[PDB]
Amino acid sequence: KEDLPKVVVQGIPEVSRAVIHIDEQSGKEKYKLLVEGDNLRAVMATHGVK
Amino acid sequence: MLLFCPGCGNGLIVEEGQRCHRFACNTCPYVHNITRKVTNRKYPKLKEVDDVLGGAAAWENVDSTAESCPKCEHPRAYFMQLQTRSADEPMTTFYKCCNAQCGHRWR
Amino acid sequence: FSIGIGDVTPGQGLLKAKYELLNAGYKKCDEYIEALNTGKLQQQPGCTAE
Amino acid sequence: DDEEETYRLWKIRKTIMQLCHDRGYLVTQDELDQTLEEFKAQSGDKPSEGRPRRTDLTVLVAHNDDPTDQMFVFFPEEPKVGIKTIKVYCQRMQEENITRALIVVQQGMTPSAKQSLVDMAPKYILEQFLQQELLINITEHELVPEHVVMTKEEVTELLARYKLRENQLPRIQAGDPVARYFGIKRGQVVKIIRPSETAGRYITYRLVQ
Numbered sequence: 418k419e420d421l422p423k424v425v426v427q428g429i430p431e432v433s434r435a436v437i438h439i440d441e442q443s444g445k446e447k448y449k450l451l452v453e454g455d456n457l458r459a460v461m462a463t464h465g466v467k
Numbered sequence: 468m469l470l471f472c473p474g475c476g477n478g479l480i481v482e483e484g485q486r487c488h489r490f491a492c493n494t495c496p497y498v499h500n501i502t503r504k505v506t507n508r509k510y511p512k513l514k515e516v517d518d519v520l521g522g523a524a525a526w527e528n529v530d531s532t533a534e535s536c537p538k539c540e541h542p543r544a545y546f547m548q549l550q551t552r553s554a555d556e557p558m559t560t561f562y563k564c565c566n567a568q569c570g571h572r573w574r
Numbered sequence: 575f576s577i578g579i580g581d582v583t584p585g586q587g588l589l590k591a592k593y594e595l596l597n598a599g600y601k602k603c604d605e606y607i608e609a610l611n612t613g614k615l616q617q618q619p620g621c622t623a624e
Numbered sequence: 625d626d627e628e629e630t631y632r633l634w635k636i637r638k639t640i641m642q643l644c645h646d647r648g649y650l651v652t653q654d655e656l657d658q659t660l661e662e663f664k665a666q667s668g669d670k671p672s673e674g675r676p677r678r679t680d681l682t683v684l685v686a687h688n689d690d691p692t693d694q695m696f697v698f699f700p701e702e703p704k705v706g707i708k709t710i711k712v713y714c715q716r717m718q719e720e721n722i723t724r725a726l727i728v729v730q731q732g733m734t735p736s737a738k739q740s741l742v743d744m745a746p747k748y749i750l751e752q753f754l755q756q757e758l759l760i761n762i763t764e765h766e767l768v769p770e771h772v773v774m775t776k777e778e779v780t781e782l783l784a785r786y787k788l789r790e791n792q793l794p795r796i797q798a799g800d801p802v803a804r805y806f807g808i809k810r811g812q813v814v815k816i817i818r819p820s821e822t823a824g825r826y827i828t829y830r831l832v833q
């Protein structure tokens with residue numbers, strides 16, 4: 418009971434916090450991801466990320 | 468849930484009995500069999516947030532409006548005033564003029 | 575080229591505008607305090623209510 | 625599953641074939657421009673697709689240098705490639721007379737298997753690539769400049785114009801991701817074209833050591 422809620426079920430363990438930043442460009446508003454992690458390989462390897 | 472024995476007030480654990488699992492104490496032979504369901508929930512905190520930010524409406528939580536910037540000289544502005552300088556007695560300005568997404572950032 | 579006490583004194587209209595702005599700001603701050611303490615206050619995205 | 629796995633396989637295959645194209649080996653334009661629908665037509669499900677035997681590639685021969693020289697690509701099914709699979713691939717390449725092989729691991733490799741792959745045979749050159757890194761092409765990245773392998777005469781004329789030696793050139797580790805991407809041997813010099821802020825390009829050189 419103590420160690421079960423602290424198990425990973427989806428995502429990268431090195432990733433701690435990720436936020437969705439937006440850009441107010443007049444041409445088009447685009448969305449980027451600001452991740453407070455230390456695993457760039459996993460970030461660039463995930464699906465849906467350029 | 469933490470349960471205690473009436474005999475000595477020690478902690479009760481769960482142990483498999485000859486006919487049914489029961490609460491037992493490690494010091495006294497006092498036991499208590501289980502008849503029906505006994506549950507103990509915790510209800511952890513759910514991440515109800517969505518983490519959306521960067522909106523121009525929320526970004527324009529600034530004072531300076533309708534000023535004259537030294538770059539394009541347009542009303543819109545976003546000023547920051549800093550006083551954390553003892554070697555430089557005057558204060559410090561940081562202007563952010565952005566309506567057509569110019570991105571002006573200087574001192 | 576000299577500076578005197580009269581070079582930094584405020585004007586009548588300046589004092590009137592200052593009084594009006596202080597009153598308006600105090601009223602808006604009281605409204606925000608009452609909205610947060612009693613009822614629901616519009617939470618800015620990316621931060622808490624306080 | 626059955627949706628992300630096939631996409632990962634298709635993207636890894638595309639990255640591997642682009643890597644082989646960058647090294648100057650025979651690849652057709654059809655394999656260059658291969659959409660996900662073509663891979664689905666090849667295999668649209670995970671059980672229908674075979675990682676160890678269906679995804680293998682052997683048409684890689686140097687169209688510029690030699691059709692006899694041949695490269696092989698392996699996709700082991702197990703996450704941790706054991707030394708048994710390594711020896712099987714080694715004997716297969718011995719029977720097929722192929723001295724250049726690449727392996728795409730899934731999750732890792734045993735230390736004994738790593739040491740063996742390091743010193744299995746001086747004539748057989750085998751490279752290792754994690755499937756996680758192969759999900760994106762390093763060359764297509766905007767931060768990574770363009771790297772071109774130089775020949776012996778080019779390095780010679782460079783050292784003649786600059787009046788330098790090989791050890792005086794800037795170094796770059798053999799374990800560099802770009803070095804493994806191009807499969808550069810120790811002692812070669814590669815030219816790098818850094819994109820400047822202006823329209824010009826900065827030309828530099830690095831010795832693989």
Ligand SMILES: [Zn+2]
Pocket residue numbers: 471472473474475476477492493494495497
């Ligand atoms: Zn007791």
Ligand SMILES: [Zn+2]
Pocket residue numbers: 535536538539540541542543564
């Ligand atoms: Zn302006």
